[PDB]
Design a protein around this ligand. Structure first.
Ligand SMILES: CCCCCCCCCCCCCCC(=O)N[C@@H](CO)C[C@@H](O)c1ccccc1
Length: 236
């Protein structure tokens, strides 16, 4: 694209493709904090200046949906209020391109602390596969940016985020005369969130809230995509 954030977008996407896809199950810096079905949520305990920064990584596998579909739903602001439960208000600050926008939103007070807001560029991209034997990758990157129309608030502490939802479709076509159905596709998801709360709060509580809220979102959101796509032609 030609918008002013193209280089930053490419950098963020590249960093996610190399660092975020790395296997974390046998990485002792990480702890498996939540497991349920195909869902696993891991976190790395990190603080700077007493502020909790814990990188979060979740993996999931969702039957019957494609990575394109999952990423479309996650990115599309027109369905945001259908699945998101942690937001108070949001609006689009600017539209940069057909696949890239800047969003301002305030969050419900889930932490024992002041309300947080956030101002982020949200971009959906396809990373082509090197071979037809591999899956294409779809990724939505949400990362903080500044904008003149959304300066610091008087009432809210400005959090900073670097989040990616990265998805690949696996297909297992049926053995004979049948056409591929949704019974034959599975979406592998890696979701990474690095959130800087923008000020101090008790780590024990922030960690409990993350352990509760991320798996709640992932189940609700993935269920939503399953419901909304059920019975429709497959969007690879
Ligand atoms: C950033 C403000 C922090 C206040 C909220 C505390 C963390 C609560 C856990 C929320 C988990 C659900 C995340 C769904 C999620 O990814 N939400 C999208 C769409 O609203 C924006 C996003 O990429 C984001 C991620 C993490 C935190 C905030 C926003």
């Amino acid at each position: 694209g030609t918008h002013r954030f193209v280089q930053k977008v490419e950098e963020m996407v590249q960093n996610h493709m190399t660092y975020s896809l790395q296997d974390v199950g046998g990485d002792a810096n990480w702890q498996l904090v939540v497991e349920e079905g195909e869902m696993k949520v891991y976190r790395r305990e990190v603080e700077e200046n007493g502020i909790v920064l814990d990188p979060l990584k979740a993996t999931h596998a969702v039957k019957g949906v494609t990575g394109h579909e999952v990423c479309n739903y996650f990115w599309n602001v027109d369905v945001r209020n259908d699945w998101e439960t942690t937001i108070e208000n949001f609006h689009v600050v600017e539209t940069l391109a057909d696949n890239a926008i800047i969003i301002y939103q305030t969050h419900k007070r889930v932490w024992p602390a002041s309300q947080r807001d956030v101002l982020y560029l949200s971009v959906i991209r396809k990373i082509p596969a090197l071979t037809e034997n591999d899956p294409e990758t779809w990724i939505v990157c949400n990362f903080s940016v500044d904008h003149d129309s959304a300066p610091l608030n008087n009432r809210c502490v400005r959090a900073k985020i670097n989040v990616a939802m990265i998805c690949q479709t696996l297909v297992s076509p049926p053995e004979g005369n049948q056409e591929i159905s949704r019974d034959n596709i599975l979406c592998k998801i890696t979701y990474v969130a690095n959130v800087n709360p923008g000020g101090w709060a008790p780590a024990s509580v922030l960690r409990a809230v993350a352990k509760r809220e991320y798996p709640k979102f992932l189940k609700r959101f993935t269920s939503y995509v399953q419901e909304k796509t059920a019975g429709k032609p497959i969007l690879f």
